[PDB]
Design a protein around this ligand. Structure first.
Ligand SMILES: OC[C@@H]1[C@@H](O)[C@H](O[C@H]2O[C@H](CO)[C@@H](O)[C@H](O)[C@@H]2O)[C@H](O)c2nccn21
Length: 346
């Protein structure tokens, strides 16, 4: 009851920088978003990413780390082993820069040492469309597909597609129908394509079918943020998935808070309550009878959904939230608990 689960996907962010390694404490410093309902002339400012003031309501046990530091990567992979999360679902922004390329190779290498697998979470990069998506899928499978840590499920790579609704089903069909003009089906570049189910079934069911997605995930850690992230819908979403040959990968998270970077977004806060929120959400995923589960997140520190260890910290600039009556690694060990319960259910 300690082995990795390769149907458990944990969303991982590689965008953190340090002055020493990256030239800037990347992402630890971050713009504060203006209030989308708050009128003109806002000067919301920025979080400077100093030791005292970072762009999170929580504070990492590992400090203001670099995602390109091989020693941090080793520690993260040991944390995945503790959590029993076999798949690292890597945020991918199509930066087309040598620093991205280096980082992806470092992550794959570190993952392989611990038998962790890596798949890609394809983000909404500029001018994203099905043609450049195909080209990027080809590039990723070509560059990384023979890496021993590259994930496959029953012989197929798997990609999560964030904000897949931003692209019309008539475009998706070209890529994802077996008859599509630029199909990946039956090619060397075929993959399980997992789209983001947001809103109501009346909208999302025909979209998933007409776009030829292999499955869907929900992402948001905050319960009730969307229809898809409301766990009382998961039984019915799974029933529909099974009836239509789709893979449902609900996303569970331990809490949510992003008010350092989005001070106006307090309605989305979901309190951790010493792990009871995480337990409730993970239980609903398991009870829905799904084949795979995703975890939002390993380390989206801006959104306060991370399971990565956090420590108490009060600086002159901010009093951070922390894991309260739980130890810093509690969310990793509680993840392992739920992975066990999930496996018992399969
Ligand atoms: O991973 C899914 C998606 C991300 O696209 C999204 O990134 C945006 O927001 C973050 C701040 O949270 C910012 O730092 C990024 O540069 C990007 O603009 C964010 O991680 C998120 N939240 C829900 C879904 N996402």
């Amino acid at each position: 009851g300690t082995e990795l689960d390769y149907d458990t996907f944990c969303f991982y962010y590689d965008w953190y920088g340090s002055e020493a390694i990256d030239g800037q404490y990347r992402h630890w410093a971050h713009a504060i978003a203006p209030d989308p309902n708050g009128g003109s002339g806002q000067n919301p400012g920025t979080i400077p990413g100093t030791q005292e003031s970072i762009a999170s309501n929580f504070y990492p046990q590992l400090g203001r780390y670099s995602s390109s530091d091989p020693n941090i990567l080793t520690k993260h992979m040991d944390m995945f082993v503790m959590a029993r999360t076999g798949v690292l679902a890597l945020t991918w922004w199509n930066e087309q820069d040598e620093t991205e390329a280096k980082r992806i190779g470092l992550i794959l290498d570190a993952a392989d040492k611990k038998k962790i697998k890596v798949c890609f979470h394809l983000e909404p990069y500029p001018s994203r469309n099905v043609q450049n998506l195909r080209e990027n899928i080809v590039k990723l499978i070509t560059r990384y597909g023979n890496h021993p840590a590259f994930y496959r499920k029953d012989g197929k790579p798997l990609f999560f597609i964030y904000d897949s609704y931003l692209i019309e089903p008539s475009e998706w069909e070209k890529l994802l129908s077996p008859g599509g003009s630029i199909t990946i089906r039956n090619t060397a570049y075929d993959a399980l394509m997992i789209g983001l189910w947001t809103s109501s079934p009346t909208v999302q069911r025909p979209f998933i079918l007409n776009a030829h997605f292999d499955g869907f995930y929900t992402y948001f850690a905050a319960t009730g943020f969307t229809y898809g992230s409301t766990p009382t819908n998961w039984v019915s979403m799974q029933k529909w998935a099974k009836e239509n040959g789709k893979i449902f990968i609900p996303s569970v998270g331990p809490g949510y808070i992003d008010t350092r970077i989005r001070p106006w977004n307090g309605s989305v806060i979901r309190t951790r309550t010493d792990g009871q929120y995480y337990d409730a959400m993970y239980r609903k995923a398991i009870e829905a009878g799904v084949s795979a589960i995703s975890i939002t997140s390993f380390n989206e520190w801006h959104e306060g959904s991370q399971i990565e260890p956090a420590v108490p910290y009060t600086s002159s600039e901010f009093t951070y939230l922390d894991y309260e009556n739980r130890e810093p690694d509690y969310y990793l060990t509680r993840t392992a608990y739920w992975v066990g319960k999930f496996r018992e259910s399969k």
